[PDB]
Amino acid sequence: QWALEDFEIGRPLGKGKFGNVYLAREKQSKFILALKVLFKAQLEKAGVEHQLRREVEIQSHLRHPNILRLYGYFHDATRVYLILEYAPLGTVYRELQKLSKFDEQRTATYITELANALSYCHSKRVIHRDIKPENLLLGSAGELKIADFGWSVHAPSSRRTTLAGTLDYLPPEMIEGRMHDEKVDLWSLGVLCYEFLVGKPPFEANTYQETYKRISRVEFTFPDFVTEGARDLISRLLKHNPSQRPMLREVLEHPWITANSSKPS
Ligand SMILES: Nc1ncnc2c1ncn2[C@@H]1O[C@H](COP(=O)(O)OP(=O)(O)O)[C@@H](O)[C@H]1O
Ligand SMILES: Nc1ccc(Oc2c(Cl)cccc2Cl)nc1
Ligand SMILES: [Mg+2]
Numbered sequence: 001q002w003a004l005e006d007f008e009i010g011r012p013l014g015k016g017k018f019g020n021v022y023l024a025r026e027k028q029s030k031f032i033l034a035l036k037v038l039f040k041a042q043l044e045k046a047g048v049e050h051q052l053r054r055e056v057e058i059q060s061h062l063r064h065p066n067i068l069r070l071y072g073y074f075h076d077a078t079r080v081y082l083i084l085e086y087a088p089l090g091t092v093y094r095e096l097q098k099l100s101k102f103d104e105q106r107t108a109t110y111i112t113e114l115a116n117a118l119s120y121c122h123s124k125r126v127i128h129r130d131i132k133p134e135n136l137l138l139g140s141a142g143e144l145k146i147a148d149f150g151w152s153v154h155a156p157s158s159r160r161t162t163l164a165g166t167l168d169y170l171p172p173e174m175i176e177g178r179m180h181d182e183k184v185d186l187w188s189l190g191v192l193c194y195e196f197l198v199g200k201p202p203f204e205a206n207t208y209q210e211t212y213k214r215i216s217r218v219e220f221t222f223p224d225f226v227t228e229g230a231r232d233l234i235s236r237l238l239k240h241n242p243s244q245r246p247m248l249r250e251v252l253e254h255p256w257i258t259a260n261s262s263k264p265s
């Protein structure tokens with residue numbers, strides 16, 4: 001069906017490990033979208049073909065206002081192309097770099113939108129496993145959309161692929177290579193809530209080896225300006241034992257969230 005000839009390519013939107021993402025326009029309809037380009041030789045070398053297939057299959061069948069759409073894919077003997085919904089306001093990562101920290105109202109609102117999206121995912125027993133600011137995109141009204149389903153799966157699970165980059169958002173059961181489930185995304189939700197209010201993630205460190213130590217021991221502390229409501233929520237999410245982490249309805253109904261979020265559930 002689709003081929004490269006059907007599109008006019010424009011400015012680079014971002015880079016990922018394999019991904020190289022461009023603004024693009026389809027010729028007949030003038031429809032604006034994003035084209036995520038992957039090199040076959042790099043996919044083969046890294047052995048991550050199965051991850052790419054999962055990304056396409058999982059993300060294409062989901063339909064939620066806070067989840068980025070994937071429309072289709074094609075390929076041409078050097079490259080694979082994913083056709084994505086274009087997010088015009090960029091990444092949460094970029095916004096955090098601009099502002100250093102978010103206020104309580106911005107944070108609670110982002111957390112509500114995240115929890116909504118994740119509730120829809122978990123209702124299909126889909127877990128994302130790579131929630132972090134570079135994978136959260138902003139639509140035209142400034143609303144948050146989860147993206148980058150390359151690491152997503154169905155639960156329960158072990159891990160089959162090597163851990164590539166940052167440990168900063170992963171829970172203990174994941175970094176210790178044990179069995180995991182839905183609750184991994186709740187831990188990441190706690191890391192995010194902290195990073196939004198403080199400007200850095202709670203277990204950050206100079207080396208892999210010590211970051212590992214701080215995560216498995218759950219060693220984090222709060223600066224003075226973090227209020228009591230935020231501390232209560234974050235402390236509940238960042239529990240070593242997964243089963244003690246709250247349900248998503250409990251997050252969406254937490255008093256600090258309901259007091260500060262400017263969106264409903
Ligand atoms: N649909 C999109 N709209 C706008 N920018 C995007 C879009 N998709 C990706 N980007 C930009 O490109 C980056 C990498 O895309 P991503 O799908 O996360 O690739 P990877 O799997 O390599 O991490 C994102 O962090 C973002 O900066
Ligand atoms: N269903 C599906 C979705 C994506 C996909 O990517 C490719 C392609 Cl086109 C070629 C080689 C390897 C991979 Cl992983 N192949 C099938
Ligand atoms: Mg990414």
Ligand SMILES: [Mg+2]
Nearest residue numbers: 016148150151
């Ligand atoms: Mg990826």
